[PDB]
Design a protein around this ligand. Structure first.
Ligand code: HEM
Ligand SMILES: CC(C)c1ccc(NC(=O)O[C@H](Cn2ccnc2)c2ccc(F)cc2)cc1
Length: 434
């Protein structure tokens, strides 16, 4: 009457660790079936990990507030990247204000100068890196830069960028992420070797605010932010919120974009691309807000389906402070409760043919899709991400046709914190169009 099933473990100290990491999808789908149940509890190093793997129950995982299902204790890994007292590392009532602060920078108000701004920077990269009319790309790596450029372009003010280029803002993020490795969620030079890259960026920041005062973007907005108790944000506090904002968008969107273009450039799917064209073809090079947002519904379905099939975030997780019920089963305080976009988006009631890419499919259980989370942890980057990505496809499939070298689409590479299409498989051949 008290707790969901448990899965067999041959040797206890290992805790399913190699079984997951080999393939976590295969793994989890096997647990589900065999264990004749969508909810089920796996062990990692004798640490009990109960997955909410029946789509019908998603509400159970995402509705209860942080005090009942706490994210902090799982995501401690990030404290050195974000800050100490920022995001999870901060206290919840406070964190919420940070969420809203950030959310009050991606508001649809500040999106009016984004579409063109990102559209322009796409070409800059194209005309300067895709030079010939016969192409090579490592799409994963190329998207990686388009995204971190267009975002910086979107959120970094002219004075900021000139001091901190997109091309090598990355290098900092990419030094900060080096601190993060697998097997940190359930269990140093890099604490300082990433600390140095934060301390670098931070003092690069503090050095631009002095040039602002003696005299608006995400930074600008963030500094004019005042807490409940009327306090302002510390230098590092603010610095982190740029880091987290920016970290968050970059792999997930790069991957989302890379996946998306891969399916579309694939012949198997070239009725969809033609539909993409029937959608973007009477649009001129002058992309405006109303175009990407109101007149690109099918393009959005492609992007959404790309996330549906290969979600970049495989698990989200909480720490069960109070006890919670989920279907018949119950989850006992002290447990790590998880919920996996990857497994969930493979349930068969919800997504028939879950390895098929059907942009015009529709979840058959309501709430199944959770590639941007749900409940009280709905992603705040969502609209923006969709906006980047949409515009990029719009621009890049207008003015090009694309050709995957392979016979079929790449294989996800489950061997990272944030999953995308296998790097070495992402080679593509572009060819100009007029
Ligand atoms: C396009 C790819 C993206 C995906 C797939 C994605 C996915 C998700 C998911 C699954 C969550 C839930 C996390 C959780 O339950 O703890 C989430 C939350 C969040 N995402 Fe995103 N995200 C994306 C882009 C972005 C971007 C661009 C931003 C920032 C601009 C962002 C900021 C956040 C934040 C702040 C949260 C936390 C919401 C909360 O805990 O209350 N995400 N995202
Ligand atoms: C607004 C400030 C206060 C703030 C607070 C929290 C976040 N959260 C965050 O970035 O979560 C990413 C996951 N994510 C990526 C894309 N969309 C979501 C993440 C990374 C590693 C982990 F371990 C757990 C979570 C962002 C900004």
């Amino acid at each position: 009457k008290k707790t969901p099933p448990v899965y067999p473990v041959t040797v206890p100290f290992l805790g399913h660790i190699v079984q997951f990491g080999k393939n976590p999808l295969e793994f989890m789908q096997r647990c589900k079936r065999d264990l004749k149940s969508g909810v089920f509890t796996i062990s990692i190093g004798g640490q009990r990990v109960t997955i909410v793997g029946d789509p019908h129950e998603h509400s159970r995982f995402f509705s209860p507030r942080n005090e009942i299902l706490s994210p902090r204790e799982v995501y401690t890994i990030m404290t050195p990247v974000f800050g100490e007292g920022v995001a999870y590392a901060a206290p919840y009532p406070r964190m919420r204000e940070q969420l809203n602060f950030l959310a009050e920078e991606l508001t649809i108000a500040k999106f009016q100068n984004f579409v063109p701004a990102i559209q322009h920077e796409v070409r800059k990269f194209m005309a300067e890196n895709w030079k010939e009319d016969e192409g090579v790309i490592n799409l994963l790596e190329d998207c990686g830069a388009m995204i971190i450029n267009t975002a910086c372009q979107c959120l970094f003010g002219e004075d900021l960028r000139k001091r901190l280029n997109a091309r090598h803002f990355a290098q900092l993020l990419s030094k900060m992420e080096s601190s993060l490795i697998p097997a940190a969620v359930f269990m140093l030079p890099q604490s300082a070797r990433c600390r140095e890259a934060r301390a670098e960026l931070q003092k690069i920041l503090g050095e631009i605010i002095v040039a602002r005062e003696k005299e608006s973007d995400l930074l600008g907005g963030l500094l004019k932010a005042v807490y409940r108790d009327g306090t302002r944000m510390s230098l590092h506090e603010v610095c982190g919120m740029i880091v987290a904002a920016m970290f968050a968008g970059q792999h997930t969107s790069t991957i989302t974009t890379s996946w998306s273009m891969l399916h579309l450039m694939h012949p198997k799917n070239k009725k969809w691309l033609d539909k993409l064209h029937k959608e973007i073809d009477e649009f001129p090079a002058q992309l405006n807000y109303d175009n990407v947002m109101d007149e690109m519904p099918f393009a959005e379905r492609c992007v959404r389906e790309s996330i549906r099939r290969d979600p970049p975030l495989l698990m989200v997780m909480r720490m069960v402070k109070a006890e919670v019920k989920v279907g018949s089963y119950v989850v006992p305080k002290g447990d790590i409760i998880a919920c996996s976009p990857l497994l969930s988006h493979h349930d068969e009631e919800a997504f028939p043919n879950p390895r098929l890419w059907d942009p015009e499919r529709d979840e058959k259980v309501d709430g199944a899709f959770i590639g941007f989370g749900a409940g009280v942890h709905k992603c705040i980057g969502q609209k923006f991400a969709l906006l980047q990505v949409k515009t990029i496809l719009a621009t890049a499939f207008r003015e090009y046709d694309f050709q995957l070298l392979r016979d079929e689409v790449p294989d996800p590479d489950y061997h990272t914190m944030v999953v995308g299409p296998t790097l070495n498989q992402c080679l593509v051949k572009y060819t100009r169009k007029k």
